[PDB]
């Protein structure tokens with residue numbers, strides 16, 4: 001089995017798995033929509049009670065499976081719980097990353113497309129004070145790129161450039177993945193992470209120089225880091241905080257598990273896992289939190305900045321920030337740097353969510369890496385046409401797989417590993433080979449707190465939120481639901497074929 005060549009490579013690859021669009025695009029919007037500082041308390045608590053414990057559990061499960069030649073959940077869940085139902089639940093460890101990859105790679109392609117256009121100066125020319133006269137050109141720019149509907153039909157009409165850039169983006173992802181773990185993902189992470197860090201720091205510095213009649217970047221930081229204990233009783237903020245923690249740490253996506261399956265059986269995962277998690281958090285709250293929000297607040301003030309964040313998931317990062325940058329000397333190049341940063345952040349994460357399907361095809365169906373990577377790319381490329389042409393399909397996939405799915409899967413992996421497999425066996429497995437040991441208190445957090453926490457969260461979700469999503473949405477959501485349910489059935493069929501191949505292989509041995 002392939003293995004990470006170096007310790008630093010492993011850490012940076014895992015850090016790249018985590019540090020992505022979630023840190024720079026998702027976090028700012030989530031924090032802004034939820035009262036900034038009022039979001040941070042639940043966020044920090046979720047990191048301590050859910051993020052950290054699940055990260056260790058996923059690293060442990062992956063390393064455990066890898067030692068037996070398995071890097072994906074259909075097989076790993078079965079190793080932990082010898083029940084056919086384990087294999088089926090395990091399918092989510094292939095389905096979630098595949099579905100998320102389908103829309104995540106497309107959004108990643110937008111950052112490459114924007115980076116290219118901003119680099120070459122093919123950007124809107126706002127009329128040099130009306131806030132709408134400046135923002136409108138950038139909104140039109142994004143809308144023409146992805147092809148937002150101008151009428152009643154829920155159809156998107158992406159520009160030819162956007163389509164070609166998606167092709168290029170898939171090719172770049174393939175070029176890295178086809179080289180494998182050590183020579184592909186690891187080697188790239190050693191280049192991309194330092195680059196991402198430098199670009200992010202530079203952008204934070206430039207943003208911190210922003211001062212307008214409406215405010216300064218400092219006003220943005222105060223908004224984000226000022227506690228608001230009167231929201232701690234709001235379920236919505238907690239659901240948002242936990243959701244962000246899962247997304248940003250790549251938890252419940254089967255991605256951490258697969259990457260960990262390449263860690264040598266004897267190698268530490270306690271310190272390594274904690275480090276990857278900490279690096280992500282610093283990149284999220286310190287870097288991601290200090291770019292978009294402070295810039296928006298400095299130029300528009302808090303009230304307007306919050307309204308912008310609530311506008312959409314892409315308004316702040318693809319419209320507002322470049323519009324703000326356009327009002328400064330060298331602003332177009334600053335926009336280029338921002339989108340280049342987003343592209344590298346996305347790329348290091350997209351290769352991580354495609355690797356689970358690749359590992360499954362290699363490990364269970366015995367395909368060569370070349371064939372596994374190409375077929376995985378083919379499925380993602382084909383499937384992405386749904387997200388590129390059907391309005392709000394992206395939103396539907398992000399909901400079932402990237403929001404509900406990951407929390408459900410996180411709870412599932414915890415129950416299977418810490419309850420069914422055995423709390424003490426699990427604890428032993430996590431700490432084996434550790435450079436440091438997991439604090440004793442976390443044994444109780446993992447066994448009792450985390451699952452209870454997630455269970456309650458899921459119940460409240462299915463009661464006070466999803467019913468509106470099942471009855472208050474446009475009929476076209478069923479097109480996406482139908483397709484992704486089909487993807488689940490397809491993956492289940494592949495797991496079925498994998499078990500049949502194993503049976504025939506065992507009979508011949």
Ligand SMILES: CCCCCCCCO[C@@H]1O[C@H](CO)[C@@H](O)[C@H](O)[C@H]1O
Pocket residue numbers: 157158159160161163382385
């Ligand atoms: C393998 C799956 C193929 C699905 C058919 C995809 C057809 C895409 O069609 C292409 O879309 C681009 C972006 O809108 C346009 O710019 C091109 O002119 C158009 O030919």
Ligand SMILES: CCCCCCCCO[C@@H]1O[C@H](CO)[C@@H](O)[C@H](O)[C@H]1O
Pocket residue numbers: 116160161164
């Ligand atoms: C990285 C290289 C990407 C090449 C993509 C080229 C897509 C060509 O696309 C065409 O470009 C013309 C000029 O901008 C426009 O006037 C056309 O409407 C557009 O369809």
Ligand SMILES: CCCCCCCCO[C@@H]1O[C@H](CO)[C@@H](O)[C@H](O)[C@H]1O
Pocket residue numbers: 156157158385386387389390
């Ligand atoms: C569910 C996903 C279905 C994807 C099918 C896409 C078929 C593309 O359809 C094509 O798109 C082009 C650009 O938008 C148009 O210029 C062509 O006239 C149209 O036929």
Ligand SMILES: CCCCCCCCO[C@@H]1O[C@H](CO)[C@@H](O)[C@H](O)[C@H]1O
Pocket residue numbers: 155156389390479
């Ligand atoms: C599920 C989402 C699909 C989005 C792609 C919509 C393409 C709609 O485009 C339409 O397709 C018709 C059928 O070929 C053509 O007859 C029309 O001329 C064309 O405009």
Ligand SMILES: CCCCCCCCO[C@@H]1O[C@H](CO)[C@@H](O)[C@H](O)[C@H]1O
Pocket residue numbers: 048049438439440441442445
């Ligand atoms: C609810 C999650 C809290 C996480 C914070 C853990 C802080 C670690 O706490 C430390 O753990 C060590 C090992 O068990 C003990 O020996 C120390 O006395 C204790 O202070």
Ligand SMILES: CC(C)C[C@H](N)C(=O)O
Pocket residue numbers: 017018019020021022023100247248249250253255349350352353
């Ligand atoms: C799906 C995950 C790979 C996403 C990544 N953790 C991010 O923050 O963008």
Ligand SMILES: [Cl-]
Pocket residue numbers: 144145159160161162
């Ligand atoms: Cl375009």
Ligand code: NA
Pocket residue numbers: 018019020022023247248249250280284
């Ligand atoms: Na992240």
Ligand code: NA
Pocket residue numbers: 015016017018019020021344345346347348349350
């Ligand atoms: Na990344």
